[PDB]
């Protein structure tokens, strides 16, 4: 389920009330996160669980949850690069309902997108390194894209 802030604490535990707040009632067993817990590490743990519990049937969950896991691992260690949060948002958009074979992957990307929506300063703090995907090959001048 999507993370909610302290402002949403004054809301009745109904399906329609939590549905209009941008989350789900779910099993109605709420979990509280304090100020000590880093949101990036918590979302990394959640996505690690969700990626290793994929059944492997369909491409977006099976091949995109490990990408989000690796991005969150890099953000945890301060090895984040530009475009990582954009990749996480694209994964949120493209792992929604109707795009995967079952509802496991929309539930996987709900906490990631809610924590990005509410705690974006913690995810942006992990991006330190410049984006690098290639190494230099001697004798070939790279296409310097601007």
């Amino acid at each position: 389920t999507d993370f909610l802030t302290e402002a949403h604490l004054d809301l009745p535990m109904e399906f329609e009330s939590i549905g209009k707040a941008g989350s789900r009632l779910g099993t109605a067993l709420a979990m509280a996160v304090d100020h000590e817990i880093n949101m990036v590490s918590l979302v990394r743990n959640l996505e690690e669980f969700f990626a290793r519990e994929s059944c492997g049937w369909c491409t977006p969950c099976r091949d995109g949850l490990p990408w989000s896991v690796k991005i969150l691992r890099a953000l945890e260690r301060g090895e984040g690069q530009p475009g990582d949060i954009e990749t996480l948002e694209q994964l949120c958009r493209f792992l929604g309902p109707g795009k995967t074979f079952c509802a496991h992957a929309p539930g996987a990307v709900e906490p990631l997108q809610s924590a990005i929506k509410y705690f974006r300063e913690e995810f942006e703090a992990g991006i330190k390194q410049p984006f690098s995907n290639t190494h230099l090959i001697n004798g070939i001048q790279p296409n310097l894209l601007k």
Binding site: N138, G139, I140, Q141
Partner: protein, 198 residues
């Protein structure tokens, strides 16, 4: 090892006859007059070799006759188009002995990139060739290298000194191929300059 035309034969070479043959070959290889014949872009590189930056005149090969009777060398510098092939054959037939042929460029060698309905696939389909130059176009110094190769081939061929006395057959040297000669120094190459510099 020689090739006879009138057969894979041996060296026919008195010591005065050998000296006379050497003098005739020296005079022939040091005075080679090409025929001014323009077929395609390879001719542009050939006449570039004739200019001041390369100066093919240093080898005594600049006179560039417009008449086939006065020319000793025919350079097929360009594509052998099917409409131009009888012209090439007629101009070659109007040349007088001794005469030599250099195919310049991929078109004259084999047809090159023009395996097409209107192109003869190489000039050696219909006229005999002495030196082949790969390239499209070969650079002017490649043409000068072929000129030196032709000079080496001329320098140890055997032709009659007079048409009234002696053997009238033409003996052409069976040279070692340049590929097998240069294989030792070419395979030993390890490192080249990287293509990112000038």
């Amino acid at each position: 090892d020689y090739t006879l035309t009138r057969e894979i034969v041996t060296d026919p070479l008195n010591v005065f006859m050998g000296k006379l043959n050497d003098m005739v070959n020296w005079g022939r290889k040091n005075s080679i007059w090409p025929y001014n014949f323009g077929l395609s872009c390879c001719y542009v590189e050939m006449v570039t070799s004739f200019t001041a930056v390369h100066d093919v005149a240093r080898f005594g090969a600049e006179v560039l006759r417009a008449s086939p009777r006065q020319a000793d060398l025919m350079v097929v510098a360009g594509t052998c188009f099917t409409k131009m092939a009888p012209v090439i054959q007629r101009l070659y037939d109007q040349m007088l002995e001794p005469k030599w042929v250099i195919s310049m460029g991929a078109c004259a060698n084999s047809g090159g990139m023009y395996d097409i309905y209107s192109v003869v696939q190489g000039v050696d389909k219909f006229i005999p060739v002495d030196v082949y130059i790969p390239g499209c176009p070969p650079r002017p110094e490649a043409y000068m290298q072929a000129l030196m190769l032709l000079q080496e081939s001329i320098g140890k061929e055997r032709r009659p000194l007079s048409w009234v006395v002696g053997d009238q057959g033409v003996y052409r040297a069976n040279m070692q191929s340049e590929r097998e000669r240069k294989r030792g120094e070419r395979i030993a190459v390890t490192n080249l300059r990287t293509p990112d510099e000038i």
